[PDB]
Design a protein around this ligand. Structure first.
Ligand SMILES: Nc1ncnc2c1ncn2[C@@H]1O[C@H](COP(=O)(O)OP(=O)(O)O)[C@@H](O)[C@H]1O
Ligand SMILES: Nc1ncnc2c1ncn2[C@@H]1O[C@H](COP(=O)(O)OP(=O)(O)O)[C@@H](O)[C@H]1O
Lengths: 373, 256, 195, 48, 169, 132, 191
């Protein structure tokens, strides 16, 4: 160990000061503070070009002290494992890290995520589906660790470019956005992440509400400077606004992953342009005539049957559908964002109900003074 | 994990007396103990109570003490005299909940896996609420929101303990809280029913107004998901009264 | 390693475990020291949605103690005369049954003292049945290891006064086991099924 | 009430048939030794 | 190893053992267990009133309080009553003739029915009276008849009747 | 030797413990002691009462375990409010407002220990709708 | 006889499982706990010693009791992964030992510290002043590597033993190895 310390004091400016700290730490038998020093050196402004050499040094130190912090060591040495960049032996490297630390802490599950990430990079058929599913299967009795949860959210968000998960991939991407609040990475990449999530909602079918991303400031402010037409389109999907010209400009604004599914964009916006009538009018206008449908969705007469059919299937409107008068009864069982800036409308309706109830209560009291007085 | 809880009319007064008897020297306003009972069919019930002196400091809400050996001895004695009784949760007064609850729940959950919190308003009798139930859920606040504590309220209803009807009738023997005097009593039933509806719905209107002002954090992600359907449910259509013009008016005219 | 923690639990968890049944047994053995209701077991194999029982009490009552809370039904086979709680109305403990009035002690001699030396004359026959009866008692394990189950029914026929009764009692004394005598000529009972 | 006794265990316990049809056993009263009481003899029992 | 092997002894002695504290509680639970009186509901007086005969004493009437599933209770069902709790706290199915049960469920290990010779005609008589009606009711359905009920065996005291009865048992 | 028109300020929770304990141990004639204090000669007040499992022996003084009672009293002193023992309660399904011979004997022992040790008869089975 | 009621608060920080002492510092502090509890037991077997934690929690299950095995069992596998909360730890030790106990029993709180602490000087000085007003008797023993007898600890002890107080000392231990006998030599009979 003293010989390795003497050799390790070289190969970097400012390193021997940390190496002297490392010498003091194992002299007094410190492991947690050693991991912080290892964390500081790895996150030092250097590329860690000697990835193999530092891997040997770190494994040398850990194996002759055998009392380091397990979860944080794997969180740090994983950077070296990824940087070595050889998947055929990287799988063996992850098995070696699993064997060196086989506890049920964050170490093993992080190793599983590293296995899944490697399978994305090369060999996207071996164990990809089993790995991603098993991460959630193993996050049991772990409500708020939030460390590997963010890891699992990141892999599955990068798994959006895979047949297995599109809507769920967007959901866990939102989960990543919630669990990690600070930016902690360039705004441009977050704006790209917002672009991918926006395309995920547009291409998806079951994402009718798709909440926490429509008017979310954390997602919109990333693209507040570029491609604001994406911000408007999501607001159109949220509040039921049609803006068919703008939404068509959305279709060919970001050509990849949108040109083929622009028809699905047509159906979803026609599906979601009726909700604005649904919550604004609490059965006040319960006659959804064909002309009213035409105003709301700018759709033909034959497509109304399919649109209201899909509305009943998803859960937008569940009322009776006639054709002699073409009247659609209004029940909604799938609420979504109601534009909290416009909460005055529901507040006014609620206070209208309060005034009516109190007035009738006083009226029946007036009719009942002959008993209650 | 429990579907709902049901509180007996058996422990509410016992907790209040325990608050009164141990508040003589402890003016912390904070009374903390454990509620014992049984959970059988996704319905949790409380059958016994116990209070422990408990002091707090506002500094990060981490200054406290209990008598755990005495409390554990109580549980063994209670289980020995009645095996079916088990600690269903731990209770704290002072409905303005502080931050030590997470530390208390972590310590006491070794007695009950689904640890729950109970708040008893000894002095407050706001409308009719004797106590409130709380469930600990920290499994991510929501799909796209940051981490939080988020202690939710599992639905609680006052149950009907057996053999206590004799005692409560003998105790009060003055108000006769029953359907006695059917016409007048139902009038009183209609009176405070309107009073309760007006008070609670006014509170909902105030919450909507305060959300509009934005002075408080907005929990919209469940507020509009639960109130939108409430608003849009078509109970205002009068054409079903047209279809049912004789909804009962025939029974009204025969009774005449 | 991890022994000293395990057994400091184990020996403590052994002795405290056994002490509470010592308390409990007492708490139920005084009840078992005061049973009052005969056990006319009318069984149900009530598998819990294991078993259960109905007890016709002495005072003409019936008590359905759930799943038979104290005694296994393997040993608690149905019948009568098995301990029942007077207060808890539960099966307490097995106890000897009633031996059908006459059979309780009809002519049962506890132990005969007549010896084989005082009888004789038919020594070949008496030795023959000793090998077929007495040896299956003393050296019963010899037949068990051999694999041949000894015969049981020995019919001793001959005019009266040939010493059959002494020989049977002498053989029983040699076996040092229970001897039961049946008054055959008087087993013809007018009561139906009495014999 | 007074009833006969049936039998007993090795010494302490006494399995008894009672005129109330009772499968009755009791710890014999401290004033009465087990030697005096014999099988088939009538003994009074205190109801408590 | 001394700290290893001395462990492996002490916990095994228990496992099945040290299973007493709860056995003690269960029999203490029995000690304060209420013994609920048992009767047969002769008939249902009303939807909440049920006329029940105590197996020995008089017919009482009781009433399920909130959730005892009064619909499943039938005239002649078995329920538990208490002269104090006034109601049925739980319901109970029936009986099985216990004395008969064990003496009919203690058939000793026998040999196959093929181990007795000269009674193959009797063997096939037993097959076409027991096995045939239950295996193939479709043939008898085309026949349209009920299967036969019983068969009698008689003769010298030594035939193999006990062997055949024990073999079919 | 002075016993005027004495009155008991029994508490509602003491009643609830009585009915719960009686409802649990219905046919067993379960025993207990009424935790009260003689603030003066005749204005006795009972604020709390506890439930104890009757031993298998039956109604006996040793059934109320002295060590268990002492530990229970210490637990009440540490958590709750201490209270003296000057009474006892017993669910009495057998017959009414009187005491059995063994109940009289154990009450005599209680009277020797305490100053009065009132003999309280509570019938758990007769109290059904209106009269406890 | 003058009897002593001692409440120990043990540092279950993230560093305590390191091998600065032979097994660990956590076990070394556990060995510090049972020897002083043994000394209390030898003085009188009914001397009571209780456990307090400060790793973002306050362990009360092991109450102020004479038995030592419960301390050994419950403190073992304490999972020393959390942080240190010095201000809360001693204070809750005061409340826990403030519980029902004999007036003859001399109230004393003992603290074991083995890891560096990051707490505000102002907050701990405020606690020291508050404990000075409350007349609290606490002695603190250090172990292993730390900024041992730091300015906060020295002022905290000085407030609690000054003004003609008990005179409880805090020892400046060498980092790593330490002599537990020399650490507890003074307060076991003087302070
Ligand atoms: N071999 C014998 N040795 C001694 N006594 C005998 C012998 N054979 C018969 N006895 C006498 O005969 C009597 C038994 O008569 P009993 O049992 O009626 O004859 P059996 O057994 O032939 O029917 C005995 O009292 C006994 O004294
Ligand atoms: N046909 C047979 N085949 C084989 N063994 C027989 C036969 N008949 C009688 N036995 C013998 O007789 C004994 C069975 O008695 P059994 O004759 O079945 O009584 P029962 O005729 O009253 O039914 C057995 O030991 C058996 O070996």
């Amino acid at each position: 160990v003293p010989g390795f310390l003497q050799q390790s004091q070289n190969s970097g400016p400012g390193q021997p000061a940390v190496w002297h700290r490392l010498e003091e730490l194992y002299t007094k038998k410190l492991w947690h503070q050693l991991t912080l020093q290892v964390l500081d050196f790895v996150q030092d402004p250097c590329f860690a070009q000697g990835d193999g050499l530092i891997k040997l040094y770190e494994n040398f130190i850990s194996e002759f002290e055998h009392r380091v912090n397990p979860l944080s060591l794997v969180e740090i040495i994983l950077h070296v494992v990824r940087q070595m960049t050889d998947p055929n032996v990287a799988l063996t490297f992850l098995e070696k890290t699993r064997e060196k630390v086989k506890s049920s802490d964050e170490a093993v599950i992080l190793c599983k995520t590293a296995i899944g990430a490697l399978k994305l990079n090369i060999g996207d058929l071996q164990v990809t589906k089993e790995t991603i599913e098993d991460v959630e299967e193993m996050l049991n009795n772990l409500p708020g660790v939030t460390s590997v949860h963010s890891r699992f959210y990141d892999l599955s968000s990068k798994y959006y470019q895979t047949i297995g998960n599109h809507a769920s991939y967007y959901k866990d991407a939102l989960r990543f956005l919630g669990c990690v609040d600070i930016k902690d990475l360039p705004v441009s990449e977050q704006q790209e992440r917002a672009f991918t999530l926006g395309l995920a909602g547009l291409l998806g079918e079951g994402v009718f509400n798709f909440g926490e991303l429509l008017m979310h400031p954390v997602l919109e402010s990333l693209r507040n400077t570029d491609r604001q037409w994406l911000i408007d389109t999501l607001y159109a999907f949220n509040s039921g606004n049609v803006e068919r010209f703008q939404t068509l400009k959305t279709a060919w604004g970001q050509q990849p992953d949108l040109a083929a599914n622009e028809a699905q964009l047509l159906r979803k916006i026609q599906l979601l342009c009726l909700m604005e009538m649904t919550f604004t009018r609490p059965a006040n206008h319960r006659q959804l005539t064909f002309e009213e449908i035409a105003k709301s969705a700018k759709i033909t007469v034959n497509e109304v049957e399919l649109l209201v059919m899909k509305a009943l299937s998803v859960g937008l409107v569940k009322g009776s559908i006639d054709e002699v008068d073409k009247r659609v009864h209004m029940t909604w069982v799938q609420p979504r964002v109601l534009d909290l800036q416009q909460i005055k409308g529901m507040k006014d309706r609620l206070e209208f109900w309060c005034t009516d109830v109190k007035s009738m209560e006083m009226l029946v009291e007036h009719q009942a003074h002959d008993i209650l007085t | 994990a429990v579907q709902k809880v049901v509180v007996h009319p058996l422990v509410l007064l016992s907790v209040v007396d325990h608050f009164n008897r141990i508040g003589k020297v402890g003016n912390q306003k904070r009374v903390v103990g454990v509620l014992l009972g049984s959970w059988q069919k996704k319905v949790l019930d409380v059958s016994n109570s116990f209070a422990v002196p408990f002091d707090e400091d506002d500094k990060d809400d981490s200054v406290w003490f209990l008598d755990h050996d005495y409390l554990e001895n109580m549980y063994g004695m209670f289980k020995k005299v009645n095996a079916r009784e088990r600690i269903v949760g731990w209770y704290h007064t002072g409905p303005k909940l502080h931050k030590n609850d997470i530390a208390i729940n972590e310590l006491m959950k070794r007695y009950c896996p689904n640890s729950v919190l109970v708040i008893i308003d000894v002095k407050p009798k706001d409308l009719g609420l004797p106590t409130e139930a709380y469930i600990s859920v920290e499994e991510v606040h929501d799909d796209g929101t940051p981490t939080s504590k988020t202690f939710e309220h599992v639905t609680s209803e006052i149950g009907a303990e057996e053999a206590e009807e004799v005692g409560v009738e003998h105790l009060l023997r003055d108000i006769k809280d029953t359907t006695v005097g059917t016409l007048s009593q139902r009038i009183t039933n209609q009176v405070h029913g309107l009073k309760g509806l007006n008070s609670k719905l006014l509170d909902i209107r105030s919450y909507l107004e305060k959300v509009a002002t934005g002075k408080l954090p907005i929990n919209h992600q469940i507020i509009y998901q639960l109130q939108d359907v409430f608003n849009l449910l078509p109970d205002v259509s009068l054409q079903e009264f047209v279809k049912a013009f004789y909804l009962k008016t025939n029974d009204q005219m025969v009774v005449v | 390693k991890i022994m000293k923690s395990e057994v400091l639990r184990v020996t403590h968890e052994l002795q405290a475990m056994k002490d509470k049944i010592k308390e409990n047994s007492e708490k139920i053995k005084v009840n078992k020291t005061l049973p009052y209701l005969v056990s006319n077991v009318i069984e149900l194999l009530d598998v819990d949605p294991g078993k259960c029982a109905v007890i016709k009490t002495s005072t003409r009552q019936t008590y359905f103690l759930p799943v038979i809370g104290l005694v296994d039904a393997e040993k608690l086979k149905p019948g009568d005369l098995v301990g029942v709680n007077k207060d808890s109305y539960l099966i307490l403990e097995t106890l000897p049954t009633e031996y059908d009035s006459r059979v309780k002690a009809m002519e049962v001699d506890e132990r005969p003292t007549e010896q084989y030396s005082d009888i004789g004359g038919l020594d070949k026959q008496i030795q023959e049945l000793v090998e077929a009866i007495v040896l299956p008692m003393n050296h019963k394990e010899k037949f068990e290891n051999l694999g041949i189950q000894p015969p049981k029914g020995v019919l001793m026929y001959g005019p009266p006064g040939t010493g059959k009764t002494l020989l049977a009692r002498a053989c029983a004394a040699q076996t040092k086991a229970t001897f039961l005598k049946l008054a055959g000529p008087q087993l013809v009972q007018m009561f139906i099924g009495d014999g | 009430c007074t009833k006969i006794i049936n039998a007993d265990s090795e010494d302490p316990k006494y399995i008894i048939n009672v005129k109330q049809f009772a499968k009755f056993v009791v710890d014999l009263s401290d004033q009465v030794a087990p030697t005096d009481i014999e099988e088939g003899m009538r003994v009074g029992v205190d109801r408590n | 190893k001394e700290i290893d092997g001395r462990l492996k002894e002490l916990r095994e002695q228990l496992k099945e053992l040290t299973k007493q504290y709860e056995k003690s509680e269960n029999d203490l639970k029995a000690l304060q267990s209420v013994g609920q009186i048992v009767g047969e509901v002769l008939k249902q007086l009303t939807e909440e009133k049920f006329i029940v005969k105590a197996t020995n004493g008089p017919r009482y009437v009781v009433g399920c309080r909130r959730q005892l599933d009064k619909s499943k209770l039938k005239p002649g069902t078995r329920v538990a009553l208490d002269m104090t709790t006034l109601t049925i706290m739980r319901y109970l199915p029936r009986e099985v003739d216990p004395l008969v049960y064990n003496m009919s469920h203690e058939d000793p290990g026998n040999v196959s029915y093929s181990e007795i010779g000269g009674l193959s005609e009797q063997i096939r008589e037993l097959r076409e009276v027991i096995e045939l009606p239950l295996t193939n009711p479709e043939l008898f359905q085309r026949v349209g008849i009920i299967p036969p009920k019983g068969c009698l065996l008689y003769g010298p005291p030594g035939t193999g009747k006990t062997l055949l009865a024990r073999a079919v048992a | 030797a002075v016993d005027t028109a004495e009155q008991v300020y029994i508490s509602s929770l003491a009643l609830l413990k009585m009915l719960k304990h009686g409802r649990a141990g219905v046919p067993m004639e379960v025993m207990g002691l009424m935790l009260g204090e003689f603030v003066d000669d005749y204005t006795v007040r009972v604020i709390d009462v506890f439930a104890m499992p009757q031993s298998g022996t039956g109604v006996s003084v040793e059934a109320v375990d002295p060590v268990f009672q002492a530990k229970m009293l210490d637990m009440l002193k540490q958590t709750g409010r201490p209270e003296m023992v000057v009474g006892w309660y017993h669910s009495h399904p057998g017959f009414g407002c009187w005491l059995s011979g063994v109940d009289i004997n154990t009450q005599q022992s209680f009277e020797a220990l305490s100053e009065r040790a009132v003999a309280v008869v509570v019938d758990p089975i007769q109290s059904v709708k209106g009269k406890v | 006889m003058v009897l002593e009621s001692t409440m120990v608060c043990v540092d279950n920080s993230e560093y305590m499982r390191n091998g600065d002492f032979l097994p660990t510092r956590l076990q070394a502090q556990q060995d510090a706990v049972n020897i002083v509890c043994h000394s209390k037991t030898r003085s009188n077997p009914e001397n009571n010693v209780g456990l307090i934690t400060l790793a973002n929690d306050c362990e009360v299950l092991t109450t102020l009791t004479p038995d030592t095995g419960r301390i050994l069992s419950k403190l073992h596998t304490v999972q020393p992964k959390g942080k240190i909360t010095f201000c809360t730890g001693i204070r809750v030790a005061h409340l826990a030992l403030k519980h029902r106990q004999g007036k003859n029993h001399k109230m004393r709180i003992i603290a074991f510290v083995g890891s560096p602490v990051e707490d505000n000087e102002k907050d701990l000085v405020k606690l020291a002043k508050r404990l000075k007003k409350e007349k609290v008797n606490v002695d603190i023993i250090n172990f292993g590597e730390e900024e041992v007898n730091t300015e906060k600890l020295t002022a905290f002890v000085n407030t609690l033993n000054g003004k003609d107080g008990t005179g409880s000392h805090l020892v400046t231990v060498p980092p790593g190895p330490s002599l537990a006998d020399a650490l507890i030599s003074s307060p076991i009979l003087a302070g």
